[PDB]
Structure formats: structure tokens, C-alpha cells
Structure 1
């Protein structure tokens, strides 16, 4: 058929309403159900064909055609069934076309991840609210989140107390309790979300600090002798003050290396995991605490304690572990020594404001783990306006995800409340526009479909990149295209992130006022390589036909800096990924 963006653009969105899948992640050889929601808004009956293509990078790996009639104004669902190929840890793009005669009149894509374990390609989201609600309402929220292929959900502030997560007892759980902020939590909603997430192969993570206890922790059987102190004379136990309307005036901190604290908190968590079928303990930390000491006055190097705590927790609970190393504090220790599923780094402002840090955090995770662990970043967008009733900026949110995803990272940002705007996950003062939601759908399809080019077996490339006529940088500098290259078996990959509209390289966009980047069309990229082993050159972008691969024209040339490919690029908006297939 005649696939053309000339005439698809005229009637795009007017037949195919949505395309998505039944689960977030699939095991090799699973049945994948692709769900296509058709809504004929063409003001005219449709009598034609729905084509489906399954792509692995540039290659067609499967194809289906289905004859469909749908009346003007009618809605139909069409389910397509595909066996997941046998190779583990592979991403695919699914392209759907509505074809009349032999012209494509609509198109929408989704993605499929075939991974036996979430740990290689984490796509982490959150649930922050646990009110009384029907299983059907909960199912709709999980359905929404599943559209983004999120393969893990952090349940934030579900628990009863930091030192006693289970309300009631294992023999008789309390169906309703207060969380840390005196919100009502309903146990049946927690359980419903867990069951629903599991039906979509989504991991569910239980949030708690490593080392926190309420004001009345002595009443619950914890001891001051296990505490972390701000002086060597046990005068002042370290603590994190909270607002006066909350369930405790402060959280008192404990020494993670204290074996009695470990025994106490592991037993308390064991009770919680017995009642609520969580897969993961997401162990939060507060970062550096200044000079700290145990009860007996011995200095405690807090970061030095993390790995032992985390490994012992994994053993005690028989559950997966993730740890938040805030501002990378303890990242070296966790990445080298802890059996965590992946690395997790929250950025707490003002530091690490530069775009470069979005890449550098991921690079640090890769380097410190000898390439054995993936990295998730928490980077709260438009934080500067997070106390206003306002909107996320659709431009800066895309640039931040391009920066993180191109570096081989994941960004924890989507959840039940929409998107994160500050460290307190339930704070929902910023809302996503309809336009931003569409972009996030595309960006998450991209994150999934191109996981093998983004964070699978890659190394930094030394090969020189030039973009003649256009200012470039390797580190996210203002007024440049940010560009760099990576190499893996069978492919070289070049990223271009458009910061030509950026005056100041702050990824946060504190006023939520960034603008659309300038669009550059029909330009050249020069890529200097020695090897004459090129099969072809391709480009994919979440900004262009939701990640559909385009074959690029190129020439082999040579100048005063050596031999290079001159690559013709049709368009750059936010983020393009060029990939060069080797013979």
C-alpha cells in the first residue's frame, strides 16, 4: 500500500483512536494481544483493511492484515494476537495502518517488550493514593498506566509506620489506617492494585526508608541504642522533621549497620510482605546526614553501611530490593556491592541542574556497576512551580526524557496522579496537558521499542561527530545540538538532542516556560569511522511518526580529518536517534 504522510496527516486520528497491549512486559513465546480501538470520525463509512507490522529495529519480524468495515460514527475494538519471539530481552515497535483502496489513511503505533525480568529495562512508575474505591476503578487506573508499558510501580506512602509498616497483625490485618501524612489508606485498594498490576506482569514495590522510626518508636519495641546520632555522646538522635499536621513530629533515624535494627525492621517488613503481595522493597534514604555516630560514639560512614543492609534485607525477606541513593550518595557502594535489581538516583535541587547530569548520573551507574545494572533517575520536572495550580511544560518534559532515555536511563515520573512535580509523590498541583500526554505515550513507546539500542550492550564511542553549520556539544550546552555516539555489536548509535532554543542548560525549567525547539530540516551529519562495514543508516524519533524507522541517504566521504559517513537527516525537533547497521 501507499504509506504517505501527505494524506495520513489529513485524516490522522480520525479512524484509529488508540493502540496498546494487554500487558507491560512479556515472557519469550507469550501470547501478545494488541488492542486496537477504532472510532470512525471520517464522516463516511470505512470499508478497508487494517495492517499490522511487528518491527525489531529496522526489520519486519511479523505482519498481519484484517478486513474491517466500520460505519461513520461507529466504534469497534479489534484484537490482534502475536506470539512473542523466543529471544529474551528484546523490544519491538508495532505499527498499525488503516488502508482504503491502496492508500494509508490512518496510523498509530505501540511497543512490545519481551523481557523475562524487569531489571534489565526498568520502566518505573508510581501509585501515590489509596482511597476507598472499587476494583473496577482501580483496574481503569492500572489500564491507563499500562498504556505506557510501565513494568514496575512504586507504592508511595501506603504503609502504616516506617518502623511498623503493617497496620494490625498478620493474623488480622487492619483494613484502614493513617499514613505518615495522616491520609486514610485502605488495605483493599492496596491489594486490588497489586492483583491488577500482577495480571499485567507489573512488579509492585513497597516504599519505606532504610532507617526511620516514629516519635513513639520505644512503644513499638525499637531502642535508642540502635539509633544514629548527630554527636558522639548520644545527645541528639538524627531526625527528619515533618509538618505538624502529620502522624509524627519527626522521623528518628537508625544505624543501618546495627544488627538489632536490621532484625527489627526485617521482621516488621516480613509481616507487611506476608499480607500485601509486594515483589520489591524500595529502600529510600535521605542522603548525606553530616557527621553521624552510633549510640556508643563510633563514627558511622553512612554510605558504607548500605550494601550490607540491602543484601541482608534481600536474604531475610526473599524479595527484590531497590535503593534510592539520593544525589548519588552511596551509589558507588550500592552499584559495586549490593544485589539490587537496578540503581535509582533521586536528584534533590538546586545542585545537578545542568542537562549533562541527566546523562552523567546514568554513566556513573553504568561505570560503578561495571555495566551490570541499569539506572532509574527521579528528576522532578518544573519543581519551581510545584506549589502553584499549574501545568507541566510539554517542551522541557520532552527534553528531560530525551536526555535520560538517550543516555540509557529510565525516568520515574508517571503514576496514578499524572506526573511527579516534587519529592512528596502525592502532591499533584501540576497537571499534564492533553498534548503532553500524547508526547509521553510516544516517548514511552520509544523507550520500550528501542531498548536494545538505548541500554543493551553499549559502550561510549570515540568517533568524531560534526553537524556542519549547527553548533554542537557533547554535554548538553545551551544553544547547541547535544550529540554523542555509542557502539554495540552490529550497530553504532548517534543521538541528537535539540537545545538550540535553550538559553540556560537547566533541565528543571523552574518557571515551566520553555518553548518548542527550532526545527532543523534536511541537514547533514558527519560521522567519522575507520571501518568500511556499513550495511545501512536509519533514524527513529518519538517526534516523527511515533518512532517509525526511516532509512537515510548517506555517502562515504573523506576530508582533512579522515573518512566519514555524510548522513542526510530529514528533520530534528526534540530528539533523533540515528543508527548505523554493520554488515
Structure 2
């Protein structure tokens, strides 16, 4: 629509007023009063109705000014998501335009992280440049209105041991493919704009690395050595990425001191709020004093000392946020007690699934990883799950279907991206998918991460995907309390049927496609049922095949969902049955919430069972059931 609803910030403290600006357009041929109505909802409850009316001539528009739409300080509870439902109507109450916008109120980003990337521009050798600020700014306005509360600044650093010096420009000289440069004033402008929105800025940097094209900052007593000759060189040899990088022992007091101090100054120079920690990978290793030993009990695994290393960084950088990418997410058990402010895992389909002996290649393996992290830590997993990743050989020969799409100048497959975002969010996580890259292929909106090198956008973001990403972000914010606020897997097993009794929910794990993937969650006060549409489609989350493997599932209508009230008396069942709602970020609802027709019956076991009527399922529905 053209409401161009905007807020003054991405996120609010409870003691803050929300300033809304919206445009009333007389898109009719008649001069008349045009009314904007904004209903404030907290889940199913309408808290307030705001409104504003102006007489407008045909084609005349008016953007509200500071003060005309305001949610006053202290009217909303802390650490909650709200939904503003906006309608612009004419003087006969016809609806001319409509749009829904979430509002996030929170102390800070760590409870419900909604993390987006910022990186260099492909059209400029991947550089971060002052001249690209207008495009970054337009992208950041969109991110702000999607309630983004944090940004991962990808490759804005000089070298791993000298991350952000006070110089006007440096060369990421380690970058041989594009010879990117960083203008530091551009990085600072971006950090400042992020801060105006109320968001935080995280600096990406490795935690153990010393670049190739530079000199050792410490002597070799502080390096880490290979136990076994393999991918990183010979046993008794300094742990070497190949020749590009060596690595220090995480138990080296001198390295800990060095990198903590280097990062303290870098973050201070940029105005960064914390450190997005990275590592390449795990290795069995020896200290310098053990480097000639062959006794495996004198060796150790890197991931085994990550926690203690992070705890040192936290102690040494107390005012800064901290997280460490656990590639594939395999070490939560070792990292559970570490002083990370948020949990971040980059997930690849070839990693081992939290479900056990299978690759994490399906939507259900994404849920399993989110769940495993919540069980271990109480926190919402931020997931890096890059979409499609078109790959070519050395002669531009497409190696997957997504690369064939690239050659056809095609778009990301919209529903493939949305389905992965839904899978992660429905489980209680957050899919870090959106990027501000000043990249032409994003068509004026935000980009979708496609590969570990964030700046790369080989496919175009259609206007459809851009608009639906926006709806999805609103849904993820507005319903955060239902998705990931003291919300756990439910032992009760809902199922989904066609209006004729054909069972559609076939695999609650979400490993298999061609189903309505159906499972329940429980909160203190309520139950939810996630329905994810995989009818007629496969369950692979990455869609490496692009459009060769269609990811638009068969739309469903008039579904029946059953939900057993295992504990419950027949008394509360008829109460509960009157308080069943559904919401969806898909076009038919766009986070609006509707009342569902429900009957109570009794199942094979003897419990009461809700028979819930679901009008429509496009990609993702959430049923919400109040139990008090």
C-alpha cells in the first residue's frame, strides 16, 4: 500500500512514546474526509483505537506530523510484541488501503533477537563506501519498520588482529577476489543510523586468527598445534588454514589479553555495541609445550575450551555484547554455560542434525536445532541458513538448479525463502536472513542471505518476496510472546485433516514433505498449533534446486485440526473451545487474528478434543488456544 506507515524507532522501552507517521491519500475522484484508524492489539485483545481524519481533495495526500498518532509512554508492557491494524477509509467507510505493523517493546535485543546483516556492495568490489549511504539508508528505513533490533556488520574489519583502526580508509588486502576497501566514515554513519533506530551494532571478527598477509603479533609459545596431520597441516605444526591464517591457543593468557584489547579499541572506534564472534572450525590440538607429544591425553579439542575463552572475553569486555558462531551448531552442550548474550549458529544442510544420525537438511532439522538450544539455555536461537546458494564451476557451468536460475536472470524462489523463515520462527528461533547490502539485485528493498560471503546477491529479490518478508517480520515481532516467551514443545499431538477426513499431518518431525506439518507448543497460559504447508513439496530447507523444485505448496482451505486436552476436564474444554484463534503472516491475514469455529468431542483415549475449523492455509498458520 501507500500508507508509508513509519515509526520513529525500530524498538521501544516501556517508558517511551511511539510516534507513528502515516500518509492519508485521497485516491478517489471526490473531495472528502479521509480517515486513518489504527487499532492497537495485544494478541487477541484490542487495547486502543487511534484515529485521524482530514478533508482532502482528489489526489491530495497528507502525512501526519509528530503528535497526531502517538502511543503515549507507559501504555504498553515491557518485553512484549503488539500489532497495529491500520485502515484508511473514505467518508462512506469504504476501505481504501490497509496494512498491519508490529510494535516491539523490550529492554534490549537479547530476549527476542531480530538480527539483520550489513555488508559491502557487490557493484563496487564489495566495498563499504560513503557513496552507497543513500541506498543503505533506504534499506535501513525498511529494516527499522520491520522492527529489526540488531545488525551483524559483516567484513567491515581491516584484519583479524587490527579490526577497526582510526584511519579514514583501509584495504581489506586479504580480499584478493574483489579488493574491497572500507571507508570508516561510511561504517560509522551506518552504526549511527542503526543507533537512531534503537538497534545495536555488532562487529564481526574471528576470535583466534592471525591473517596471512601480516606479521605475528605474539611469539609461537602462544600458537596452537595440530595433534593429527589433516586439513590444517602436520602434527606438531602450527594450526594453519590453507596459506592464509594461523591460530592461537585459546588458553594463552597473552592471546586472550591481545584480542580482547584489540576488539575493545575497534568497537570503541566504530561505536559498536558488541562482538559477533567467528571461528572457522574445530580441531584436536596441542599447546606449544606439548607440540612434539603423540599421547592423545596431552591433546584437546578447540570447542572444549570455547566456553572458558568466551567467559574471559566477557569479563574483559563487560559493556559489550558477545556471541560466537558455532558452525552447524554442534557444541551447545559445551557452550551452554558460556556468557554469550545471544546464541548464533550458521547451519548448513550437510551438518549433523540435532535429531541424530542424519544431515540437517529438512525444515524439521531446523526446528530440532532451535529446540535443542532452548532446552540447553532458555534462549532463542538465531539461525544463519543461507538460501539456494547458486554455485558455478570455474567455467560458469551451473552446478545446481539455483545457478541455472541465475543464468535465467531469475528471482529467489519466494516461497522457499518464506518457508525456511517460518520453520525457524515457528519453532521459537529467528532466521537471520535479511541484509542491507546496497545491492542492485535487491530491487530497492532488502537482500536475502544466499551464501557465507554476505555481499553476494546472484538472484533478484522480487517485490513479492520483499513485501512478504516485511509481513513475516511483523508476524515474528507481534507474536513473539506466543512463539518464544516461555513456550515449549507440547506432548499433546494435534493432527490436520481435509474437510473430508483425509489426514494431512504425516510426520510431526518435519523431516518428510507432502504434508501439513503440524505440532503444538505450550505456554504458561495457552497452547499454539503451528501448521506449515508442505503439501506437494519436498522438505529440504535450502532449495539448492531453485525453481527446478517448486516450493509453492498446494493452498489448503476448510481444514480440520484436532487438538487433545490431555489433562483437561470436560468443564474447561467447552470454555477453551470458545477461545480458539488463528493468525498468519500470509496475504489473507497479514498478522490479523481471527476467531475459529470449534466443537468439542472426546478422543479414542477418553480426553476432550477440540475440532478446530481452519479456513485457509497458504504457507504458515498459527492457532492460538487460551487456557485461562
**Above 0.5 in TM-score?**
yes
Instruction: Return the offset for 1:235.
Output: 4.2
How far apart, in 2, do the equivalents of 1:331 and 1:489 lie? 26
- For 2:625 and 2:604, locate their aligned partners in 1 and report how far apart those are by CA, in whole Å: 23
**1:215 equivalent in alignment to 2:208:** no
Task: Report if aligned partners of 2:3, 2:97 keep a CA contact under 8 Å in 1.
Answer: no
CA deviation string 1:184-216 (max 9, x = no partner): 101101111111111111010000011111125
Match status 1:470 vs 2:503? yes
Deviation of 1:76 after TM superposition, in Å, equals 2.8
Query: Which is worse superposed, 142-151 or 436-445?
Result: 142-151
Distance 2:489 2:302 in 1: 32
Work out the CA distance in 1 between the residues paired with 2:592 and 2:227.
59
Residues 51, 65 of structure 1: 8 Å contact kept: yes
Bigger mean CA offset, 432-441 vs 254-263: 254-263
Larger deviation: 530-539 or 257-266? 530-539
Match of 2:104 among 97, 106, 113: 113
User: Hey, what does 1:7 align to over in structure 2?
Assistant: none
Aligned counterpart for 1:61 among listed residues 47, 51, 69 = 47
- Aligned CA distance change for structure 1 residues 340 and 435 (closer, same or farther; 3 Å): same
Cα drift, residue 565 of structure 1: 0.8
Determine the structure 1 residue equivalent to 2:356: none
Say yes or no: does 1:347 pair with 2:347: yes
SS at match of 1:105: strand
Q: Secondary structure at the match of 2:194?
A: helix
Match of 1:330 in 2: 331
- Aligned counterparts of 1:306 and 1:353: Cα–Cα separation in 2: 26
- Is contact 1:484–1:495 with CA below 8 Å preserved after alignment? yes
Q: CA deviation at 1:69?
A: 3.0
Which residue, 572, 591, 596 being the options, matches 1:552?
A: 596
Mean Cα displacement is larger for which, 135-144 or 146-155? 135-144
| Structure 2 equivalent of residue 280 of structure 1 | 274
| Shift, 1:65, TM fit | 1.6
Which one of 123, 126, 137 corresponds to residue 114 of structure 2? 123
Alpha-carbon offset, residue 103 of structure 1: 3.4
1:414-450, CA deviations, whole angstroms, 9 ceiling, x for partnerless residues?
1112111000111121221100001000000000000
Asked if 1 retains the 8 angstrom alpha-carbon contact of 2:531 and 2:620, the reply is yes
Taking the aligned partners of 2:265 and 2:15, their CA distance within structure 1 comes to 36
Q: In the alignment, is residue 507 of structure 1 matched against residue 541 of structure 2?
A: yes
Query: Are 2:4 and 1:18 equivalent residues in the alignment?
Result: yes
SS of 2:303's equivalent?
Answer: helix
Q: Give the Cα–Cα distance (whole angstroms) in 1 for the partners of residues 389 and 135 of structure 2.
A: 29
Which residue of 1 is the match for residue 62 of structure 2? 76
Q: Distance in 2 between matches of 1:58 and 1:268?
A: 49
SS in 1 for 2:513: coil
Distance 1:228 1:391 in 2: 44
Residue 570 (structure 1) aligned with residue 571 (structure 2)? no
In 1, the alpha carbon distance for the partners of 2:544 and 2:94 equals 45
- Give me the CA root mean square deviation: 2.0
Q: CA deviation at 1:333?
A: 1.8
Deviations 1:297-348 (A, max 9, x none): 24132111111111111121221101111111332222x2211111111013
- Report the equivalent of 1:365: 373
Shift of 1:236: 2.8
Instruction: Measure, in 2, the Cα distance between the counterparts of 1:434 and 1:450.
Output: 24
CA displacement, residues 395-418 of structure 1 (integer Å, 9 cap, x when unaligned): 111110110000000011111121
Q: Where in structure 2 are there 5+ consecutive unaligned residues?
A: 121-127, 229-233, 292-297, 351-358, 392-401, 438-446
**How far did residue 72 of structure 1 move?**
3.3
> Distance between the aligned counterparts of 1:126 and 1:458, measured in 2?
27
1:234 CA displacement: 6.3
Structure 1 residues not aligned, in runs of 5+? 1-12, 168-172, 242-248
Aligned counterpart, 1:419: 448
Shift of residue 86, structure 1, vs aligned partner: 4.6
CA distance in 2, matches of 1:293, 1:400: 40
Aligned to 1:392: 412
Give the match's secondary structure for 1:337: coil
Moved more, 67-76 or 564-573: 67-76
TM-score of the two chains, using structure 1 as the length reference: 0.90
Q: Which residue of 2 aligns with 1:156?
A: 154
Q: Distance in 1 between matches of 2:413 and 2:241?
A: 32
| Cα gap change, 1:59 to 1:510, in 2 (>3 Å) | same
Q: Deviations over 1:83-122 (max 9, x none)?
A: 2535210000111011222333321111100001110100
Measured after TM superposition, the shift of residue 465 of structure 1 is 1.1
Q: Return the TM-score normalized by structure 2.
A: 0.84
- Closer, same or farther in 2 for the Cα pair 1:557/1:185, shift >3 Å? same
Asked whether the 8 Å contact 1:124–1:150 carries over to 2, the reply is yes
Give, in angstroms, the shift of residue 381 of structure 1.
0.6
Aligned length: 551
In 1, the alpha carbon distance for the partners of 2:563 and 2:148 equals 34
2-structure distance, mates of 1:261, 1:338? 19
Give the aligned partner of residue 396 of structure 2.
Answer: none
Report if aligned partners of 1:536, 1:580 keep a CA contact under 8 Å in 2: yes
Cα separation, partners in 2 of 1:42 and 1:404, compared to 1, 3 Å: farther
Is 1:292 the counterpart of 2:289 in the alignment? Answer: no
Deviations 1:258-306 (CA, angstroms, capped at 9, x unpaired): 21111111121122122111111111122323x3222232413211111
Structure 1 stretch displaced more, 488-497 or 346-355: 346-355
Q: Which residue number corresponds to residue 455 of structure 1? A: 484
Q: 2-side partners of 1:189 and 1:546: how far apart?
A: 35
CA distance in 2, matches of 1:255, 1:25: 40
502, 521, 531: which one aligns with 1:496: 531
CA 1:561–1:464: 2 relative to 1, 3 Å:
farther
Measured in 1, the distance between the counterparts of 2:190 and 2:457 equals 20
Give the corresponding residue for 2:307. Answer: 307
Counterpart pick for 2:88 among 98, 120, 127: 98
Is the Cα–Cα contact under 8 Å of residues 491 and 582 in structure 1 kept in the other structure?
A: yes
Select the residue among 357, 366, 384 that pairs with 1:378: 384
- SS in structure 1 of the partner of residue 370 of structure 2: helix
Q: Does the Cα contact within 8 Å between 1:19 and 1:109 map onto a contact in 2?
A: no
3-state SS of 2:267 partner: helix
Aligned CA distance change for structure 1 residues 137 and 391 (closer, same or farther; 3 Å): closer
CA deviations on 1:214-265 (whole Å, 9 max, x unpaired) are: 1255x35223222222247864322333xxxxxxx51222222221111111
CA distance in 2, matches of 1:404, 1:458: 14
Q: Deviations over 1:484-525 (max 9, x none)?
A: 1111122110010000121x3211111212232111111211
Inter-partner Cα distance in structure 2 for 1:521 and 1:567: 13
Contact 1:419 1:431 in 2 (8 A): no
